Design a protein around this motif. Structure first.
Motif, short mmCIF file in Angstrom:
data_model
loop_
_atom_site.label_atom_id
_atom_site.label_comp_id
_atom_site.label_asym_id
_atom_site.label_seq_id
_atom_site.Cartn_x
_atom_site.Cartn_y
_atom_site.Cartn_z
N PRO A 1 46.38 44.57 42.23
CA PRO A 1 45.99 45.05 40.90
C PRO A 1 46.68 44.29 39.76
N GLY B 1 49.74 41.43 33.81
CA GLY B 1 49.41 42.52 32.90
C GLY B 1 48.84 42.04 31.58
N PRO C 1 41.26 42.85 58.07
CA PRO C 1 41.76 42.45 56.75
C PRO C 1 43.23 42.78 56.59
N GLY C 2 43.96 41.90 55.91
CA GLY C 2 45.38 42.12 55.69
C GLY C 2 45.58 43.19 54.64
N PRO C 3 46.83 43.46 54.25
CA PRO C 3 47.04 44.49 53.23
C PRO C 3 46.85 43.90 51.84
N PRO C 4 46.15 44.62 50.95
CA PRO C 4 45.94 44.09 49.60
C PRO C 4 47.23 43.54 49.00
N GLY C 5 47.10 42.56 48.11
CA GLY C 5 48.27 41.98 47.49
C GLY C 5 48.88 42.85 46.41
N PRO C 6 50.11 42.55 45.99
CA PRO C 6 50.80 43.33 44.95
C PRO C 6 50.32 42.96 43.55
N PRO C 7 50.36 43.92 42.61
CA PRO C 7 49.93 43.66 41.23
C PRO C 7 50.53 42.39 40.62
N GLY C 8 49.95 41.95 39.51
CA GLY C 8 50.42 40.74 38.86
C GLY C 8 51.67 40.86 38.02
N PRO C 9 52.18 39.72 37.51
CA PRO C 9 53.38 39.69 36.68
C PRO C 9 53.15 40.35 35.33
N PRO C 10 54.24 40.65 34.61
CA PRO C 10 54.16 41.29 33.29
C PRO C 10 53.17 40.60 32.36
N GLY C 11 52.60 41.36 31.43
CA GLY C 11 51.65 40.80 30.50
C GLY C 11 52.35 39.93 29.47
N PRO C 12 51.59 39.34 28.53
CA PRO C 12 52.12 38.47 27.48
C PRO C 12 52.52 39.28 26.25
N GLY D 1 48.30 39.90 42.22
CA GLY D 1 47.25 40.35 41.33
C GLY D 1 47.37 39.66 39.98
N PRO D 2 46.34 39.73 39.13
CA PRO D 2 46.45 39.07 37.82
C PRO D 2 47.62 39.68 37.05
#
Lengths: 56, 56, 55
Positions: free
Chosen positions: B8, A10, C2-13, A7-8
């Motif tokens: 997400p 944070g 459909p496959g399983p949704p992907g995992p959330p993204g990396p930490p923010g900036p 995902g994108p």
């Protein structure tokens, strides 16, 4: 099917804390040095601070 | 089949670095001239050095 | 299917830096004038205290 793509990332972080204390202004144009600070009274004599009690 | 939907968002970012050091403080100023240096004691009155004896 | 949704993204900036620090204190070290009111003052505790206080 394959699992979804990452995902994108944070959003940005919260603002940080304000900065440290600023330094005190200057001694810039100094004539006479502060007398001692000890709960005692001083008068100016012979270019020095002498205890007022001396004369009381 | 088709890949799963994209995950997400990520976790918000870490709080930024502290702020910059605050500005330096105001000038000492208002300093005054040495009193007479003559084996006599002086007190500060009316923006001048008056003999302490005047008041004992 | 459909496959399983992907995992959330990396930490923010990192976020902006904290505000500017606090304004420093005045200067020190020398004797500033004393009240000019017809009264006599002596130097005590880094301040001008009324001589009368001790008379």
């Amino acid at each position: 099917g394959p699992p979804g793509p990452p995902g994108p990332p944070g959003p940005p972080g919260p603002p940080g804390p304000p900065g440290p204390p600023g330094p005190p202004g200057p001694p810039g144009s100094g004539y006479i040095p502060e007398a001692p600070r000890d709960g005692q009274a001083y008068v100016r004599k012979d270019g020095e601070w002498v205890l007022l009690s001396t004369f009381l």
